[PDB]
């Protein structure tokens, strides 16, 4: 007597941000043992990219205003920390934005780069209400996992940084909703096997299959303290 | 007797933490005891935590 093993049958893409996966066949009592482990892993440990610093020229702190721009600078920083970006080959990158005229300033105005891409090009950053107004900034983007608030890494390194570099809090995790189901599988010999369906909602910036592979890999590497004891 | 005066204004941000007092409009009041991870929270059949 030996157990059957699950296989990654199908992946359906309902949207660019929402998807469904299916693993089958499973023995009795293995839809929950795997479902809850994978939901707890996928929600805390996936890696991604986030905005970590900004510089605007002619700006000294974040409690100021700028002439011709109808948002305070705190609102611009809050609009920037919700920007979803994917980086191909590095662990750090610096982007630039220059805009002039009247109208909204959106993420389609950041300068093009070879190996960086923006999944939502209509994210709104600020507004310009004057004809002789212009904005120019340079934005630093990094890679990591977890949630690191700016009051914790300002204690990481202590040397002098120039007046005018504004720190932003980093939420790195790209997964925002996970649900799952255990249904009765259809295999022609037995009727005591089930399938497991996982529903995933993300911000772009990650692939569902690769996410499941990372979760399973983390779990398998954590079990090695037991599979070989002492 | 005084020759001059200098005044400085600081600004501080305060995030919520265990020990802070919270209340509603009906007389219900209490202290926060714990900040706990997103995946320890009760959730409904659709995946949405509380």
DSSP string, A179-199: EEEEEE---SS-SS-EEEEEE
Cβ-Cβ contacts under 8 Å, A201 against chain B = 47
Cβ-Cβ contacts under 8 Å, B37 against chain A = 44
* Phi, psi for A23 (deg, rounded to 5): -120, 125
Question: What tokens appear for B20 in the block?
Answer: 């802070």
Check CB contact under 8 Å for A177 and B39: no
Bridge-based pairing of strands A194-202 and A175-184 is antiparallel
Neighbours of A45 (CB within 10 A): 14
Question: What tokens appear for A210 in the block?
Answer: 């690769």
Task: Find, among A221, A198, A197, A222, the residue nearest to A43 by Cα.
Answer: A198
Q: Please say whether the beta carbons of A73 and A60 come within 8 A.
A: no
Resolution of this entry in Å?
2.5
Helix axes A31-42, A208-222, angle to 10 degrees: 100
Query: What three-state secondary structure class fits A80?
Result: helix
Check CB contact under 8 Å for B45 and A179: yes
Q: Can you say whether the dihedral through the CA atoms of B8, B13, B16, B22 is positive or negative? A: positive
Q: Please say whether the beta carbons of A117 and A142 come within 8 A.
A: no
CA angle A171, A176, A180 (to 5 degrees): 150
Cβ-Cβ contacts under 8 Å, B45 against chain A = 179
Q: Please say whether the beta carbons of A115 and A141 come within 8 A.
A: no
Q: How many whole angstroms separate alpha carbon A154 and alpha carbon A148?
A: 11
Q: Please say whether the beta carbons of A44 and A37 come within 8 A.
A: no
Say which residue the tokens 């296989």 belong to: A7
Instruction: Give residue A200's Cα distance to chain centre.
Output: 13
Q: Find residue A139's DSSP bridge partners.
A: A54, A95
- Given A40, A149, A199, which is nearest B39 (Cβ)? A40
* Phi, psi for A14 (deg, rounded to 5): -75, -30
Say which residue the tokens 């300068």 belong to: A111
Technique that determined the structure: cryo-EM
Q: Please say whether the beta carbons of A3 and A191 come within 8 A.
A: no
Interface of A with B (CB under 8 A): 39-40, 43-44, 61, 63, 149, 177-179, 199, 201
């Amino acid at each position: 007597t030996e157990f059957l093993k699950p296989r990654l049958v199908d992946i359906e893409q309902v949207s660019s941000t929402h998807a469904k996966v299916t693993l089958e066949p499973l023995e009795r009592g293995f839809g929950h043992t795997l479902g809850n482990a994978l939901r707890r892993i996928l929600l805390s440990s996936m890696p991604g990219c986030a905005v970590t610093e900004v510089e605007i020229d002619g700006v000294l702190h974040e409690y100021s205003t700028k002439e011709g721009v109808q948002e305070d600078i705190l609102e611009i920083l809050l609009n920037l920390k919700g920007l979803a970006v994917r980086v191909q080959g590095k662990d750090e990158v610096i982007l630039t934005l220059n805009k002039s005229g009247i109208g909204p300033v959106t993420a389609a105005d950041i300068t093009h780069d070879g190996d960086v891409e923006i999944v939502k090009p209509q994210h709104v950053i600020c507004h310009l209400t004057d004809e002789n107004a212009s904005i120019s900034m340079r934005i630093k983007v990094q890679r990591g996992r977890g949630y690191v608030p700016a009051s914790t890494r300002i204690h990481s390194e202590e040397d002098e940084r120039p007046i005018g570099r504004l720190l932003v809090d980093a939420c790195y995790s790209p997964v925002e909703r996970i649900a799952y189901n255990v249904e009765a599988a259809r295999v022609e010999q037995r009727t005591d096997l089930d399938k497991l369906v996982i529903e995933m909602e993300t911000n772009g910036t990650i692939d569902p299959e690769e996410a499941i592979r990372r979760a399973a890999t983390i779990l398998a590497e954590q079990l090695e303290a037991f599979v070989d004891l002492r | 007797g005084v020759l001059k005066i200098v005044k400085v204004y600081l600004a501080v941000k305060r995030r919520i933490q265990p020990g802070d007092k919270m209340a509603g409009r009906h007389g219900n009041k209490g202290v926060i005891s714990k900040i706990n991870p997103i995946e320890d929270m009760p959730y409904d059949e659709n995946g949405t935590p509380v």
